[PDB]
Amino acid sequence: HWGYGKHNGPEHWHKDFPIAKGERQSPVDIDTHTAKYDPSLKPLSVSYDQATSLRILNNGHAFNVEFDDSQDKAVLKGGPLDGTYRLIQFHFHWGSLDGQGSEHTVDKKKYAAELHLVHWNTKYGDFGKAVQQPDGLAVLGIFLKVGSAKPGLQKVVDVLDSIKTKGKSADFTNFDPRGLLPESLDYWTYPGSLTTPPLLECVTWIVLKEPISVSSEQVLKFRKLNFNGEGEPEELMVDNWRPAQPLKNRQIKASFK
Ligand SMILES: [Zn+2]
């Protein structure tokens, strides 16, 4: 099955998921000089004060912090979006080295990691229905660079020892995702896809201009996770990123000049 290795990595995904070669695949390189400022874009509305985190799970490809999405508790609105998108989970993609790890790139520059806060359009009733719709998901993408520690990330880092291997989960209540946000909510936006199989073309991507900084110790702890299950041969969970895909007939819009 699919993964990030030599024999099952992103270049192989199209054999099981032909949409991998589709018209609105993600991630992409954000060429900052050719992105178009759109003054009709609204400021993002990130309403996370009532967020209810539940658990953290190693799914064999990343780790997901999952939220109660049965009510409008943590929602994303505004920006390019119509309607209300509920936060369901966040996860990261990261590298084996500080110079790689992000999925989106900025003028071909790769960041050490990329955070994806995944939201679904409440008009579709549940996440499973939303992924079947062209406007079903909104993913807020935030780049991570290595520098000073991010205090709001530390509670995530400290639980990773409990979910080292695929299939492990741990309780993870009362986590506040506002501690993962940069100061500015300036963003680029474009229509795209899930970056992992099934690669469905259901995502309005909103990628923040301002990265967050995390410490070397914080990212090193990401790199100690395992793709494998307990008792299977150990393979470090690193480089779980898909490279940039062709932009094709899309224009990236910017909320800022
Ligand atoms: Zn992702």
Cα–Cα distance, 88 to 65 (Å, whole number): 9
Gap from CA of 26 to ligand 1 centroid (Å) = 10
Domain count, the chain: 1
Residue 1 marked as a ligand binder: no
Residue 119 marked as a ligand binder: no
Residue 14 marked as a ligand binder: no
Exposure letters 112-128 (e unless 16+ CB within 10 A, then b): bbbbbbbbbbbebeebe
What method did the depositors use to determine the structure?
Answer: X-ray
Range(s) of the domain holding residue 14: 1-257
Q: What are the Cα distances from residue 138, in Å, to 57, 83, 122, 182, 191?
A: 21, 11, 11, 18, 9
* 61 classed as catalytic: yes
Cα–Cα distance, 230 to 233 (Å, whole number): 8
